[PDB]
Design a binder for these strands. Structure first.
Lengths: 93, 82, 98, 107, 82, 98, 93
DNA sequence: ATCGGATGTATATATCTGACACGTGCCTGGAGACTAGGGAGTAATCCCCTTGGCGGTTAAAACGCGGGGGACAGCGCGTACGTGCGTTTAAGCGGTGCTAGAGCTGTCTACGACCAATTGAGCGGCCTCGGCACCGGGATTCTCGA
DNA sequence: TCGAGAATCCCGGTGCCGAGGCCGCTCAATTGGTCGTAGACAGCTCTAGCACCGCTTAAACGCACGTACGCGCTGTCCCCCGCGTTTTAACCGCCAAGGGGATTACTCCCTAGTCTCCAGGCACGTGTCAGATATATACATCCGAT
């Protein structure tokens, strides 16, 4: 039975930030669980908001708004920038 | 029309009225402004988050359902406003 | 000879009638002005529902009397009838507000 | 029929297709914004970067190549913003950050 | 195999170890059993809710993801278990 | 002549090393037996994952050290270095656990 | 704008329990908001558990289990019994 | 306030290893391409809530003003709690062995999904009137000095 | 401590608008087919749990004991309660403008849904060093005599 994860991705970004520093499997699964939790956080929040907007579609503006709701101050700011970057990089595709 | 210093618009009699409602007998002065700060800090979040809703609402007026969903997201939900 | 009730007694009756009453204890307009002042910080010239701001003030005052309540309780554990700012601070601390 | 994943199209790591399938199977909205998975995954990339970075900071602060969950607890307890983000969250093998109160010290 | 009285199986040395971890110097006796009670009460919820999950899971063994979703629903979420 | 460190000092170092250490401070088997005892109350003969029960004990001990922590804090506000049950009770009270 | 509520059924069940009583429309709105709160609560919890069960079908077993998760003690017991009796009545025809 | 001794702790060292980084073959979800609908976006319209101001009132806030009441500091004692050392004890390793029950696949089927036709339960809107809110006044009961 | 006085409770009466009842007026609920499919269920594994039992030992319980914080009491200060007065601006009632909120009607861009193909991900082996552990050592720090 195939069980998906992100250890590949967390290791990728680890190297991208710290090629030297290693990783433990315990903390690895911790990271995985954590990102799952925060993704469900943002998912529920954005869905709730869109339901308030009564909009059956979920777009990036919702994501920005709801992460702003989620993140303590400057993080979000920083966050949204790269996010914008992303979609720009993807809209420029 | 730039507003300011309405925080001290909170009267010490009002604060002590709320305290008596909370069942408090003796109070010090150092509390009130401190109190006020907290008050500010408290509302500091919700309105922003509220207008954040209004942000996504693409509207200029702010509604109750905003703070409803805020207090909900703030785990302090309230009833009686839809 | 002029009469003056002993301390707290009048405030005690005030407590009693306030637990008796249920309406707000904050003047509307000052609270509203404060809210709009806070609002212009995040964005200027934003309108509001009277229902919305009534909700704001009610929910605030609720949180506030709850804070006053459990800080009273803490001061009981502090064995004092006078309140101390540290009581409020540490209450927020236990309230995870730090 | 040239292939290129949306993650490469965003030059990032988190799987836009996988997370898109996930949110689809998550039953949150009928239709979706195609760029919303990109955006959210970028946010995840960012926050993960910060937290793992602080973790590695503690790790090599302890001469530790492979990061231990204790590093994670220390990191999440040091930063104000991340701690606020994960205040009511608990961490396995976390422990408590060093903290001694003033009066605890004998005079 | 009917179990009992494992609550006192919690050793006072264990309790004081946890307290020292919490950064506590002087402790009274009256705490420990009291402590224990709380402990019980605390877990009193989760396991039930957990097996409640297992209830709907229609299974005889209890899993971690149960308590994961419990602590989540209990607003005390934990990481490192899927 | 025999030497004995002053009170707390040894316990102080214990605090220091425990904030230094991160592993559990509860014996596994007693905790597990307690969990199964609690389980049979709601339903008898239920099995468990070792991972599951490890999670139970870790999360418990976390909640427990948090309670010990903020009760320590409250006792600071109680101006004592000894702990009192009322501190724990009122802490739960502020923790909404009442 | 056609807005939907439950205050009529509130008045109904009130007369069912207290025929000689009035309500403040304020209180009715409060109660209706409470209705909505408990409804969203139970619905979200049910969807989440079904997700844990990977179920795409939310049925009465889910209902009862989620209520038990939410309501305490005799509240939950009475609610379970009531829902059971009602679904039995509906299934009887 | 210092020095000496005890003790506890940070370090280097050695090796063991088992997690762990790494690489595979194989799988399927992701990409790529194509079709439809219709949620979303825009715009013109209406409404109408809000935001603004104006004047009169007083209850309320500001401020002052003793002053008893307790916050607090200190001071005696004592009991309860750290501690180090005894004791005994289950805790942990570990390894064995059985299987009950998770956990997987393969049906087949009842079961909403969905749509279409139908409509009456329900909701916006309109009287209406009676508990309820306010008021004034009389009687009751707490409280502070004997 | 029995009165004086004061804040309060209660009683009757006044006037009101929200609570409620009813009325047009639907669209959303029902009904009934119809269909593909979620899962219900059967029926297999296998493994993780569950218990068994032994061996070692770090750990736990209790003791004695110093001791020192908790606690209890006293006196002080100051300070916040209570009341009196003076000032004010919240409120309240009314008016008015418009600017946004909500609405509807088009219009179509984007996403869901389908089908194809494969390549990144995943289970699975595989050496292998980060660090776990133990040991002796050197440094830091408490505690008591001076």
């Amino acid at each position: 039975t195939r069980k998906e994860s992100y250890a590949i991705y967390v290791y990728k970004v680890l190297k991208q930030v710290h090629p030297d520093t290693g990783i433990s499997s315990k903390a690895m699964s911790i990271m995985n669980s954590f990102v799952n939790d925060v993704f469900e956080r943002i998912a529920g929040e954005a869905s709730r908001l869109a339901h308030y907007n009564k909009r059956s579609t979920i777009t990036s503006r919702e994501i920005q708004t709801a992460v702003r709701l989620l993140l303590p101050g400057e993080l979000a700011k920083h966050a949204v920038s790269e996010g914008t970057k992303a979609v720009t990089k993807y809209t420029s595709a | 029309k730039v507003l300011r210093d309405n925080i001290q618009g909170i009267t010490k009699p009002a604060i002590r009225r709320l305290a008596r409602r909370g069942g408090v007998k003796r109070i010090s002065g150092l509390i009130y402004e401190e109190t006020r700060g907290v008050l500010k800090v408290f509302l500091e979040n919700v309105i922003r988050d509220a207008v954040t809703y209004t942000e996504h609402a693409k509207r200029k007026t702010v509604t109750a359902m905003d703070v409803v969903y805020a207090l909900k997201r703030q785990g302090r939900t309230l009833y009686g406003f839809g | 000879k002029p009469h003056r009730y002993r301390p707290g007694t009048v405030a005690l009756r005030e407590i009693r009638r306030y637990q008796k009453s249920t309406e707000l204890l904050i003047r509307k307009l000052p609270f509203q002005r404060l809210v709009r002042e806070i609002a212009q910080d995040f964005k200027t010239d934003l309108r509001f529902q009277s229902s919305a701001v009534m909700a704001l003030q009610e929910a605030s005052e609720a949180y506030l009397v709850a804070l006053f309540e459990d800080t009273n309780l803490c001061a009981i554990h502090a064995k004092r009838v006078t309140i101390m700012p540290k009581d409020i601070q540490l209450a927020r601390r236990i309230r995870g507000e730090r | 029929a040239k292939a290129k994943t949306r993650s490469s199209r965003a030059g990032l790591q988190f799987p836009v297709g996988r997370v898109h399938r996930l949110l689809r199977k998550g039953n949150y909205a009928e239709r979706v914004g195609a760029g919303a998975p990109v955006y959210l995954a970028a946010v995840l990339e960012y926050l993960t970067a910060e937290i793992l970075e602080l973790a590695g900071n503690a790790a090599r602060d302890n001469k530790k190549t492979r990061i231990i969950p204790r590093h994670l607890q220390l990191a999440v307890r040091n930063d104000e913003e991340l701690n606020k983000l994960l205040g009511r969250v608990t961490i396995a093998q976390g422990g408590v950050l060093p903290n001694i109160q003033s009066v605890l010290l004998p005079k």
